[PDB]
Design a protein around this ligand. Sequence first.
Ligand SMILES: *[C@@H]1O[C@H](CO)[C@@H](O[C@@H]2O[C@H](CO)[C@@H](O[C@@H]3O[C@H](CO)[C@@H](O)[C@H](O)[C@@H]3O)[C@H](O)[C@H]2NC(C)=O)[C@H](O)[C@H]1NC(C)=O
Ligand SMILES: *[C@@H]1O[C@H](CO)[C@@H](O[C@@H]2O[C@H](CO)[C@@H](O[C@@H]3O[C@H](CO)[C@@H](O)[C@H](O)[C@@H]3O)[C@H](O)[C@H]2NC(C)=O)[C@H](O)[C@H]1NC(C)=O
Ligand code: NAG
Ligand code: NAG
Ligand code: NAG
Ligand code: NAG
Ligand code: NAG
Ligand code: NAG
Ligand code: MAN
Ligand code: MAN
Ligand code: CU
Ligand code: CU
Ligand code: CU
Ligand code: CU
Lengths: 371, 371
Amino acid sequence: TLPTTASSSTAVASSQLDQLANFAYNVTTDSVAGCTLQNLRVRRDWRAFSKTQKKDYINSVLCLQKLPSRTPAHLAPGARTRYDDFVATHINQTQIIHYTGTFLAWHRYFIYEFEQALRDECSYTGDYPYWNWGADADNMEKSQVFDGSETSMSGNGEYIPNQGDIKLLLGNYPAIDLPPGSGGGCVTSGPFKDYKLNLGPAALSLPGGNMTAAANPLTYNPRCMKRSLTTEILQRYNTFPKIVELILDSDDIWDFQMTMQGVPGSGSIGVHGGGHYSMGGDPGRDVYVSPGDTAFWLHHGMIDRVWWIWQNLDLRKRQNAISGTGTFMNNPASPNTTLDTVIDLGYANGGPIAMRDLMSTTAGPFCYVYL
Amino acid sequence: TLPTTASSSTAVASSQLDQLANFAYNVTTDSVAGCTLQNLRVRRDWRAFSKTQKKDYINSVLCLQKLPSRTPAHLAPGARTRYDDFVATHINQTQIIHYTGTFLAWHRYFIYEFEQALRDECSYTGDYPYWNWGADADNMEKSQVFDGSETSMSGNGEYIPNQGDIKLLLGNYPAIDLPPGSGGGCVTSGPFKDYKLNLGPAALSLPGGNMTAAANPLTYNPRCMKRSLTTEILQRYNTFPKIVELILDSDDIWDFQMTMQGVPGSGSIGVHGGGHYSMGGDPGRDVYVSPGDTAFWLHHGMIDRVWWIWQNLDLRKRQNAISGTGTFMNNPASPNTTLDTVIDLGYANGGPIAMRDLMSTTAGPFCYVYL
Ligand SMILES: *[C@@H]1O[C@H](CO)[C@@H](O[C@@H]2O[C@H](CO)[C@@H](O[C@@H]3O[C@H](CO)[C@@H](O)[C@H](O)[C@@H]3O)[C@H](O)[C@H]2NC(C)=O)[C@H](O)[C@H]1NC(C)=O
Ligand SMILES: *[C@@H]1O[C@H](CO)[C@@H](O[C@@H]2O[C@H](CO)[C@@H](O[C@@H]3O[C@H](CO)[C@@H](O)[C@H](O)[C@@H]3O)[C@H](O)[C@H]2NC(C)=O)[C@H](O)[C@H]1NC(C)=O
Ligand SMILES: *[C@@H]1O[C@H](CO)[C@@H](O)[C@H](O)[C@H]1NC(C)=O
Ligand SMILES: *[C@@H]1O[C@H](CO)[C@@H](O)[C@H](O)[C@H]1NC(C)=O
Ligand SMILES: *[C@@H]1O[C@H](CO)[C@@H](O)[C@H](O)[C@H]1NC(C)=O
Ligand SMILES: *[C@@H]1O[C@H](CO)[C@@H](O)[C@H](O)[C@H]1NC(C)=O
Ligand SMILES: *[C@@H]1O[C@H](CO)[C@@H](O)[C@H](O)[C@H]1NC(C)=O
Ligand SMILES: *[C@@H]1O[C@H](CO)[C@@H](O)[C@H](O)[C@H]1NC(C)=O
Ligand SMILES: *[C@H]1O[C@H](CO)[C@@H](O)[C@H](O)[C@@H]1O
Ligand SMILES: *[C@H]1O[C@H](CO)[C@@H](O)[C@H](O)[C@@H]1O
Ligand SMILES: [Cu+2]
Ligand SMILES: [Cu+2]
Ligand SMILES: [Cu+2]
Ligand SMILES: [Cu+2]
């Protein structure tokens, strides 16, 4: 049988998670015959990628970072690459894709279409990778995603000493304080050391409490990607126990999505805010520009995975479950999201698509499972 | 001497307000010499306009509702008139002009530039009118702004019986419930009965709790202006006592602007939400499209007046006082508004202008006082 209450023990909570995942795997695989068992893709933990498989993915990303942008220049003047096309649409729609009813599904579609670009333009034929926070929550620096080696998404940034805390303001609420991490500057190694971040900053939190906001975040501001790896953040918000609490203690989609994102006032930023902010730097600390950090795709692989596990714990009730509205924290108010709500990624990839077609990983345009 | 504590008595609170206003008038007039006593314009209560003066203003508005729109068609396809130019920019910027640091100053500049259009394109040579809520708080229908006569901003809409309540959601907070008023449909008389509302709805609250949101609120949706005059709303939020509480019990700009707008969770929508929602209808109940209702300009004349009174109670401390950020309720987070923050009305009128130049009615582009 499955666990119903999350343990505080790291070792078991991991295996607790593993059981819940296998269950989710079972329901998904044996429910599939569009999507069939034959063309069912499997998304996999980055650790499970052999060296060359890691590099294949990385090279496909680098490829999208070389191919020219399709976005009409006058709409995103700072866009240069196909990768920017994805970053631009995210910055463009930030206000309607976080703390909305569409949060989970939009991101699921976002990473899927990113994947399609890798496959259709950059010859990627491997599996979509995800970053399992829990395994790295004691040492982010040793994460295979962030260790600075040739198979990381680059690693830490130039150490900058004595930086002030990050002070996160969700609305008018009291700030959540976070340490500045052990980096600060440009990433010093790894495949993306010469990657040029072109857009933003739109809302970049700085050590000290400041925030940098370009006049127009879609205009040209070429600079390095910065990181400040911050283990304390992961161990505060992204441990296996926190992951399993999120899954086991959320009886509806509202509680799920809110707990995952961090409910304002609780002093908590969830596994989702945890994973983003643990990267530090730029656009690591910019809610709008975050896809500009290459780790984003793996992070959201894991977000999608966690959502998919949760859905399968109760597929009758949860598969199509939606809650929230079309505006960030419903500010200003907007209508409830419904199964007919249409989302899109502008010029990044794919076309407009209704929520109903996004709710399942093995329906609509989707045919994948997480291992 | 001035009152420091608001009375609960309507008669005195009115005169309490009158004293505070004369004081504000005194400080403003005798501080002026750009702006001098010579070219100092006076803005006046609508009741103080003689019949022909009322009509002159109305005709100038009707004029802007006939002259063709300047907004690049591809940016606001639904725009037809110079009046739409103003409505379009408001819908366009709603998310950064309410519950922001720029709320008060942006609107002050917005109505000033509207006034400039009336004068420069529609030969208006009279005074800017404002709507004093307090005097009408017992019978909105008898308001000279809304009595349906030829000198109103049109009046009530076709009565629609048995409409459900309005259910206002500020974020995730519990709904504030309001009665549906005594209208519902198209305005039945007055100068604007054949006025065609072209934009929205963007976020239109409906009796019953529903909300109508066009896919693109800047596209073409020509329809009548609707109203449902609702006295109970004015007497709940816009009485002379409520006005004087707002002015006397707000010791800083944050408290002022928040109390005026209604702080979320308090079950109160302030004199500002009160004045808007008392109109009912469409775009009366649409925070984005509200300038589409012609009364908007008078309402915000009074908003500006109330702010101006408050500033002059303590001109040393309050004249340049700013608080808040660049995003609706700071969702998502943005940097603090500062005196260097630039605002603009797109294609409506005027150019970009910094907050510092908006803080005083007798500095920057401004040279007016309220009587
Ligand atoms: C609503 O607000 C947005 C944001 O301010 C406005 O977007 C702005 O649109 C204008 C016109 O497209 C852009 O100006 C520039 O015009 C020149 C032509 O002279 C063109 O070559 C440029 O590439 C660009 O189009 C401006 O970049 C853009 N601003 C931002 C920050 O995106 C929009 O106009 C507003 N909508 C309405 C109806 O006013
Ligand atoms: C960010 O989001 C906004 C809102 O979706 C996007 O605005 C959209 O811009 C496109 C392109 O200008 C508009 O499409 C239309 O294109 C035809 C040409 O085929 C033109 O004739 C039309 O007048 C119009 O320009 C579309 O109306 C507009 N959508 C809305 C709701 O405003 C914007 O493209 C996004 N920015 C980025 C970088 O993706
Ligand atoms: C998944 O299915 C397999 C194969 O039938 C079964 O052995 C295993 O116990 C299942 N796991 C869970 C958690 O249900
Ligand atoms: C922004 O303003 C608030 C109060 O108005 C202040 O407490 C806060 O520290 C400011 N933030 C920064 C980084 O200036
Ligand atoms: C943050 O903003 C404050 C206020 O302008 C400024 O004094 C300080 O230099 C800034 N800190 C840094 C170094 O980013
Ligand atoms: C305004 O100034 C006039 C003229 O000096 C004075 O008579 C009046 O008392 C003043 N009103 C207030 C409230 O200060
Ligand atoms: C929107 O959804 C919430 C709960 O998800 C519900 O309570 C509310 O009544 C809905 N509003 C409308 C008008 O459908
Ligand atoms: C409001 O929305 C609900 C849910 O779709 C619908 O059943 C009802 O007809 C709507 N009410 C009206 C008449 O606007
Ligand atoms: C197991 O290790 C985790 C970190 O991965 C801790 O959070 C937990 O308390 C236990 O020590
Ligand atoms: C004076 O009248 C006002 C309405 O204008 C009331 O709110 C007040 O209680 C007093 O009766
Ligand atoms: Cu996102
Ligand atoms: Cu994210
Ligand atoms: Cu407004
Ligand atoms: Cu208003």
